[model samples]
Target chain A: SMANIAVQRIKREFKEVLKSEETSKNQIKVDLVDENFTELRGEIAGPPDTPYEGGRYQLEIKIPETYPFNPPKVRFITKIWHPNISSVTGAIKLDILADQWAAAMTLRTVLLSLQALLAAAEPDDPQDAVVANQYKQNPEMFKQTARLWAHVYAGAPVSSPEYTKKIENLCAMGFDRNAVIVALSSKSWDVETATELLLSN
Target chain B: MQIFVKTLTGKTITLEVEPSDTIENVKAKIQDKEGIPPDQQRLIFAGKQLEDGRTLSDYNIQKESTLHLVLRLRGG
Candidate 1:
């Protein structure tokens, strides 16, 4: 099979997304990034009244030749502070991106759904267990942490103390910046523990 | 100038606006047409937020220029 269905579908979906109301509202956007239309990069604005508000989060999308029957491979390219999204690798643990996927869903649906997902995250089914625990027990801290991540990576202006200061301290010490952030976040801003975790390599 | 304001859901409306009209007035019109509260609407253009105090010409938003609109959702 030359993948005519995949190509045709991807092309149509791209146009569908381009013409959708969400696209003009500046909430969701998708672009065919590869020459063959198999790979794409999508962006969604963070939903209102959420910790991620005003942030632009990008997704890496891979359209399978079996699309329409199977779901597209989508992962977060923009680092986020949500439990379902991996802060370290930008992986996402969304059901629709996998088993819950339906045949009729297009890129437009997927992108806007992600924006919705940001406003309401699932902590019980987590991509980052530590972040999930924070969301469960220290909800305010989790909100602050997510806001900090939005500021550091996604261009949101919300700020909270501790993470940034500790992250910078570890980075200034020549430790890998991302690992430092992860260690600090996971260790709950315990600089001593984060240092130990980072230096254990 | 006829600047276009497109909401986050991708529904766009053409606004027959004067360059001197404040951003707040444009948002008021969006409320009239869409029922989205003007306070909940945040319009972005050229990667900048259009302030209520600023006029279309203040932001240099010209005819045919599309302003991206974002709105607040109810609390989760």
Candidate 2:
């Protein structure tokens, strides 16, 4: 059946990813989320020398029954503070995942493209306006916040006492920890403004 | 003559073509290396889509010219 193509293709791609060079190097990983082959969990190591470095980002992949006829829906399950990714919802903005999808493109290409995205962000075409502004206006602060996020959420070895203090202060107010991080980072670490923004939500 | 073909993934491949080779023939050769079907390939050179029915010489394609290979979707 045509519907079975999705499962068949995913099964092949799963094996391909496992045998790929990246998998051996711990750069990318894939696991079936279920026996039906509809859902998958993918992991990609953050690109080197970037704030996201040393971080391992998890991804959620949903394969359409249409199989190779359409691109699979993919998004970050790990919270990443980046312009092409939504810090709150984890939505991703990429052409290959949408209109530019082609039947010949495989799962390996998608994951590699995501890795490339982490290495080089497209601020002009952003999924998160606040993050894009921070990346463009104050790159140093953006890097600091991203690094702190990687440390807090993805097990990256980075510690920013100043940013941590800001988060703690907001947490003391009984605000959600993740909400505080997004607000603080988006507002450029203005505790008062971020706090106000959080309370309003 | 040899032409350089670049894929979306930044991988480049060299194709040797005769002056009489049609774009379709060139695409078939590319498929051997790129694994992308000739029907699915959208070859662009000098900002123009190379027509399958035309010869390489018709477009004045020269050796060492770079062609961008983009995958074309048939449906959905």
Candidate 3:
């Protein structure tokens, strides 16, 4: 049987997490996606001080049969705007999730770290250059964009009608809503550049 | 019935109580265990902050349900 340490540890850790104190605080919660234990769903509370605050982020975690020897594949299933996270695909760039992983760490630590990542984003070590550029060059703009994303995608409160007006303007011109949003956000809300990018692609 | 209380320090404690108990009583119980005063205790269930006058049953808190305990601010 292929039911080695991977499935065994997953079952064991999964139970521990539900009973763990994080559940009560609502910081992290994991849900089973497949019976095989290879795939799981992760939910993390957005850090209180960050733009992601009051938001809930969903993650798709895939466990390898190699067990603790290898890191679990984790990525944001929720759309977020951050330097280390892919705004387009939701891929993550964190040390523990990759080269810095240690066997002593458990599933719960990963979830907590994910929340911590939201609290402290590293714009210098960014995964999305476009977002990182904006982050360094324009701090306030990054805040508005991130808050806009948190509001739109993660159901966080506070509306961004500033973006909504531009979005409506572009969408009315027959461009796709999502495409317009991405283009405008990438182009620093420059309608001409955004419109040109949208028309070209 | 038993319910779970999660502490701010990542600890889960079980409390044995009556479902008909008031929210104030729950805070008292929390104080009995953790020494946090009832007036300072903030109990949240299902995202709603529990009022001292309300009963656990009024909030639909069933047995085995978990309640989050936070601190009420009273800045000196």
Candidate 3 residues B1-76, lDDT tens each? Answer: 9999987889897899998899988888888888777875688888779789989988889999998887753210
What is each predicted model's overall lDDT from 0 to 1? 0.82, 0.86, 0.85
Off by over 4 Å in 3: A1-3, B1-76
Tell me chain A's TM-score in each of the predictions.
0.91, 0.93, 0.94
Chain A TM-score of candidate 3 vs. true chain A: 0.94
Model 3: per-residue lDDT, tens digit, A37-133? 8899999988887888888989999998777888898999999989889998988888788766887777899899988988887887788889989
Model 1 accuracy (lDDT, Cα): 0.82
Residue A69 displacement (Å), model 3: 0.7
Q: Please tell me the TM-score of chain B in candidate 1 relative to the true structure's chain B.
A: 0.87
DockQ agreement of candidate 2 with the native complex: 0.03
What DockQ does candidate 3 score? Answer: 0.01
For model 2, residues B10-63, the per-residue Cα lDDT tens digits are 789899888799899999999888677788678898978988998878889888
lDDT of 2 by residue, A1-201 (tens): 238777678889989999999999999999988788888899999999999999999999999888798998998999888989988888888878886789888888899999889988888778888898999999999898889988887889975697888888899989999788878988899998888888773
Best by lDDT: 2
Using lDDT as the measure, what is the rank order of every candidate, best first?
2, 3, 1
